[PDB]
Enzyme design. Structure first.
Site, PDB file in Angstrom:
ATOM      1  N   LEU A 125     -16.574  14.647  96.763  1.00  0.00           N
ATOM      2  CA  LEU A 125     -17.175  14.897  95.507  1.00  0.00           C
ATOM      3  C   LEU A 125     -16.303  13.945  94.593  1.00  0.00           C
ATOM      4  O   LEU A 125     -16.879  12.748  94.416  1.00  0.00           O
ATOM      5  CB  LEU A 125     -16.412  16.391  95.134  1.00  0.00           C
ATOM      6  N   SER A 139      -9.101  13.972  97.502  1.00  0.00           N
ATOM      7  CA  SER A 139      -9.813  14.569  98.523  1.00  0.00           C
ATOM      8  C   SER A 139     -10.645  15.755  98.703  1.00  0.00           C
ATOM      9  O   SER A 139      -9.913  16.566  99.221  1.00  0.00           O
ATOM     10  CB  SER A 139      -9.085  14.224  99.896  1.00  0.00           C
ATOM     11  N   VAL A 140     -11.716  15.755  97.718  1.00  0.00           N
ATOM     12  CA  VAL A 140     -12.349  17.300  97.706  1.00  0.00           C
ATOM     13  C   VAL A 140     -13.687  16.848  98.360  1.00  0.00           C
ATOM     14  O   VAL A 140     -14.373  15.895  97.784  1.00  0.00           O
ATOM     15  CB  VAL A 140     -12.588  17.862  96.020  1.00  0.00           C
ATOM     16  N   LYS A 174     -10.581  21.057  99.601  1.00  0.00           N
ATOM     17  CA  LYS A 174      -9.711  20.140  98.954  1.00  0.00           C
ATOM     18  C   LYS A 174      -8.587  20.225 100.053  1.00  0.00           C
ATOM     19  O   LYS A 174      -7.750  21.032 100.446  1.00  0.00           O
ATOM     20  CB  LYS A 174      -8.828  20.849  97.728  1.00  0.00           C
ATOM     21  N   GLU A 204     -13.532  27.941  94.755  1.00  0.00           N
ATOM     22  CA  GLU A 204     -14.926  28.287  94.351  1.00  0.00           C
ATOM     23  C   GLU A 204     -15.542  26.989  93.819  1.00  0.00           C
ATOM     24  O   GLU A 204     -14.676  26.070  93.131  1.00  0.00           O
ATOM     25  CB  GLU A 204     -14.875  29.467  93.280  1.00  0.00           C
ATOM     26  N   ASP A 255     -17.168  17.946  84.773  1.00  0.00           N
ATOM     27  CA  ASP A 255     -15.941  18.351  84.159  1.00  0.00           C
ATOM     28  C   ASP A 255     -16.042  17.758  82.765  1.00  0.00           C
ATOM     29  O   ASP A 255     -16.935  17.046  82.303  1.00  0.00           O
ATOM     30  CB  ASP A 255     -14.990  17.539  84.980  1.00  0.00           C
ATOM     31  N   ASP A 295      -0.839  20.110  83.657  1.00  0.00           N
ATOM     32  CA  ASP A 295      -1.560  18.902  83.642  1.00  0.00           C
ATOM     33  C   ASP A 295      -2.918  19.590  82.813  1.00  0.00           C
ATOM     34  O   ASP A 295      -3.953  19.024  83.516  1.00  0.00           O
ATOM     35  CB  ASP A 295      -1.939  18.634  84.970  1.00  0.00           C
TER      36      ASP A 295
HETATM   37  O1  LIG Z   1      -8.074  20.450  92.453  1.00  0.00           O
HETATM   38  C1  LIG Z   1      -8.946  21.560  92.217  1.00  0.00           C
HETATM   39  O2  LIG Z   1      -8.184  22.733  92.031  1.00  0.00           O
HETATM   40  C2  LIG Z   1     -10.185  21.501  92.361  1.00  0.00           C
HETATM   41  C3  LIG Z   1     -10.718  20.371  92.595  1.00  0.00           C
HETATM   42  C4  LIG Z   1     -12.376  20.245  92.445  1.00  0.00           C
HETATM   43  C5  LIG Z   1     -13.018  21.370  92.231  1.00  0.00           C
HETATM   44  C6  LIG Z   1     -14.536  21.331  92.534  1.00  0.00           C
HETATM   45  C7  LIG Z   1     -15.475  20.633  91.820  1.00  0.00           C
HETATM   46  C8  LIG Z   1     -16.879  20.661  91.968  1.00  0.00           C
HETATM   47  O3  LIG Z   1     -17.512  19.772  91.014  1.00  0.00           O
HETATM   48  C9  LIG Z   1     -16.548  19.186  90.480  1.00  0.00           C
HETATM   49  C10 LIG Z   1     -16.737  18.274  89.570  1.00  0.00           C
HETATM   50  C11 LIG Z   1     -15.666  17.207  89.120  1.00  0.00           C
HETATM   51  O4  LIG Z   1     -16.065  16.440  88.088  1.00  0.00           O
HETATM   52  C12 LIG Z   1     -14.508  17.509  89.567  1.00  0.00           C
HETATM   53  C13 LIG Z   1     -14.277  18.959  90.113  1.00  0.00           C
HETATM   54  C14 LIG Z   1     -15.268  19.369  91.022  1.00  0.00           C
HETATM   55  C15 LIG Z   1     -12.253  22.380  92.019  1.00  0.00           C
HETATM   56  C16 LIG Z   1     -11.162  22.682  92.115  1.00  0.00           C
END
Ligand SMILES: O=C(O)c1ccc(Cc2coc3cc(O)ccc23)cc1
Lengths: 264, 9
Positions: A12, A13-14, A29, A80, A87, A126
């Site tokens: 998307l 380390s996610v 994640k 979720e 974002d 944060d």
């Molecule tokens: O660290 C956490 O808690 C976290 C990290 C990632 C997501 C999922 C997500 C889906 O689309 C996105 C688009 C973005 O620009 C950023 C994050 C996402 C949710 C939580």
């Protein structure tokens, strides 16, 4: 087992993912054990898991931890995933400075989400546009990434690993801060970011300087709130109640009104 | 003016 219950997608380390049990969209994640700062118990787990469990509930303003797994070298967090999302950082980059009506709705939702965190005993540490997701169809904002958070306490904090350009001047000068007043400072940075199109300060001298220059047309009422949140002395900053009672914060849009007017 | 992200960590 982790690989069986979810279909893992690309980065998307996610990673994008779908829960096989019901085709629910999830975010996967991965957090390496060697890089984990603080640990807690619930069963020894990363502090991030502790905080995510404490804020997990029906309230849709914070990201919901659906599940987690321990691996030999890492923990895996099933979060979720709203769709469609963007974002708030990319949203502001593309659209520029937001109309105050839209900034009011967004900022109000962030305040309610942060209050939820504090009510659950969690300090995010944060708050920034990068850590806020916009549900583009429902007009609802979600606070994400508790990787720098801590349990909420009323005594002084002497550690910090959040984002420096959102950190308060008492942290810059003296490496100490209190939770709620440092949070209000970061919310001042976020609100300026919303209504001006970028954050006010980039260097430490700007953070501690105590002068806020407005690069965009911003109402006197909104400027006053921002400058109040960015008071140099922590005790001069407004409480969350004073922020939400501020004249600029009145007559907020509902989330669905916000989506219909500004997002669809 | 260069708008950019700021890693935390
Ligand atoms: O660290 C956490 O808690 C976290 C990290 C990632 C997501 C999922 C997500 C889906 O689309 C996105 C688009 C973005 O620009 C950023 C994050 C996402 C949710 C939580």
């Amino acid at each position: 087992p982790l690989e069986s219950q979810y279909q893992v997608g690309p980065l998307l380390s996610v990673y994008s993912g779908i829960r096989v049990s019901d085709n629910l969209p999830v975010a996967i994640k991965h957090v390496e054990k060697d890089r984990i700062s603080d640990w807690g118990e619930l069963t020894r787990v990363p502090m991030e898991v502790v905080l995510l469990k404490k804020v997990s509930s029906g309230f849709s303003g914070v990201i919901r931890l659906l599940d987690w797994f321990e691996r030999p070298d890492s923990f895996v967090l099933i979060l979720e995933r709203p769709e469609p999302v963007q974002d708030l950082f990319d949203f502001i980059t593309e659209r520029g400075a937001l109309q105050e009506e839209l900034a009011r709705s967004f900022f109000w939702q962030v305040l309610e989400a942060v209050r939820h965190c504090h009510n659950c005993g969690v300090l995010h540490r944060d708050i920034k546009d990068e850590n806020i997701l916009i549900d583009l169809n429902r007009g609802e904002l979600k606070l994400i990434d508790f990787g720098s958070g801590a349990l909420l306490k009323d005594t002084v904090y002497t550690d910090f690993d959040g984002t420096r350009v959102y950190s308060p001047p008492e942290w810059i000068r003296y490496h100490r801060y209190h939770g709620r007043s440092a949070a209000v400072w970061s919310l001042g940075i976020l609100l300026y970011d919303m209504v001006c199109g970028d954050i006010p300060f980039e260097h430490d001298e700007e953070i501690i300087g105590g002068q806020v220059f407005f690069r965009q047309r911003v109402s006197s009422e909104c400027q006053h709130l921002i400058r109040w949140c960015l008071a140099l002395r922590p005790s001069d900053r407004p409480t969350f109640e004073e922020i939400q009672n501020h004249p600029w914060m009145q007559d907020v849009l509902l989330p669905q009104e916000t989506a219909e007017i500004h997002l669809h | 003016r260069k708008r950019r992200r700021h890693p935390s960590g």
